[PDB]
């Protein structure tokens, strides 16, 4: 089966967890404490000195988007053909871009930078509304007619931004409905309601 190794936070594992839960997959959580991380030995063994670390049998992976793409490819959550796969990547790279900005805010410039960030947020979310508007009237998924790993990543991005800036999706009807619809998928709904998700902080420094 699968093992994800990570700090006790949602962070860069939230999306891959939602994917695994929604897809009825089983996995083991190996929690790494701040104390264990500071010891240095685990960190030194990681390829890029970072978690998450992910095990799929004898395969060991690092990088959250590498793990998402791997599950996407192996579980068939990567579009119906090559053309759709490229669109899936384009969405995910866009999600990753905004996630990086979010992470920079949270960890390095929260107090001073929040106001500018929130003011800029509508312009950063609009591309995803536009993409939805151009795919079956936004009624299905972010790419094509089937769920992809980019959907789970985008959903997480949107959920953590509603916490950061309540009402940020109010001007975006397709994104709003999309969040409601995906969140209502029975296995995902169950996971999002579970203490396993709810009782972890979004980030590691108490800010959100």
Looking at the Cβ atoms of 126 and 139, the one nearer to a second copy is 126
| Binding test (CB under 8 A) with a second copy, winner from 5, 85, 188, 192 | 85
Q: Is the dihedral of CA 136, 138, 141, 144 positive or negative?
A: positive
Nearer residue to a second copy within complex by CB, 134 or 194? 134
82 contacts a second copy (rule: CB under 8 A): yes
CA distance 1 to 91: 28
* Window of 29-37, 57-65, 183-191, 195-203 that interacts with a second copy by CB under 8 A: 57-65
DSSP per-residue string spanning 113-172: HHHHHHHHHHHHHHHHHHHHHTSGGGTS-SSTTS--HHHHHHHHHHHHHHHHSTTTTTT-
Residues that bind Ca ion (CB under 5 A): 76, 146
- The verdict on whether residue 136 carries a ligand-binding annotation is no
Residue 102 known to bind ligand: no
Residue 97 binds a second copy, judged by CB under 8 A: yes
Cβ proximity to a second copy: between 50 and 208 the closer is 50
Q: In what order do the strands lie in the sheet with 53-56?
A: 27-31, 2-6, 53-56, 59-62
- Cβ-proximal residues to 184 (8 Å cutoff; 6+ apart), any chain: none
Nearer to a second copy, 90 or 177 (CB): 90
Q: Closest Cα to residue 72, out of 154, 152, 157?
A: 152
> Does 161 participate in binding a second copy (rule CB under 8 A)?
no
**Residue 205 found at the interface with a second copy (CB under 8 A):** no
Give me the residues that bind a second copy (CB under 8 A), please: 47-49, 59, 61-63, 65-66, 69-70, 73-74, 82-83, 85-86, 89-90, 93-94, 97, 100, 123, 127, 130-131
């Amino acid at each position: 089966p699968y093992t994800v190794v990570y700090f006790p936070v949602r962070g860069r594992c939230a999306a891959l967890r939602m994917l695994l839960a929604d897809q009825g997959q089983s996995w083991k959580e190996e929690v790494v404490t701040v104390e264990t991380w500071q010891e240095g030995s685990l960190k030194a063994s990681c390829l890029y000195g970072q978690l998450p670390k992910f095990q799929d049998g004898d395969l060991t992976l690092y990088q959250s988007n590498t793990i998402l793409r791997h599950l996407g490819r192996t579980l068939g959550l990567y579009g119906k053909d090559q053309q759709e796969a490229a669109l899936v990547d384009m969405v995910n790279d866009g999600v990753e871009d905004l996630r990086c900005k979010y992470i920079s805010l949270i960890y390095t410039n929260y107090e001073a930078g929040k106001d500018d960030y929130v003011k800029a947020l509508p312009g950063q979310l609009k591309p995803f509304e536009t993409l939805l508007s151009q795919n079956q009237g936004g009624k299905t998924f972010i790419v094509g007619d089937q769920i992809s790993f980019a959907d789970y990543n985008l959903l997480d991005l949107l959920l953590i931004h509603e916490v950061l800036a309540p009402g940020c999706l109010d001007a975006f009807p397709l994104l709003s409905a999309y969040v409601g619809r995906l969140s209502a998928r029975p296995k995902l709904k169950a996971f999002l309601a579970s203490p396993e998700y709810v009782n972890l902080p979004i980030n590691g420094n108490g800010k959100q």
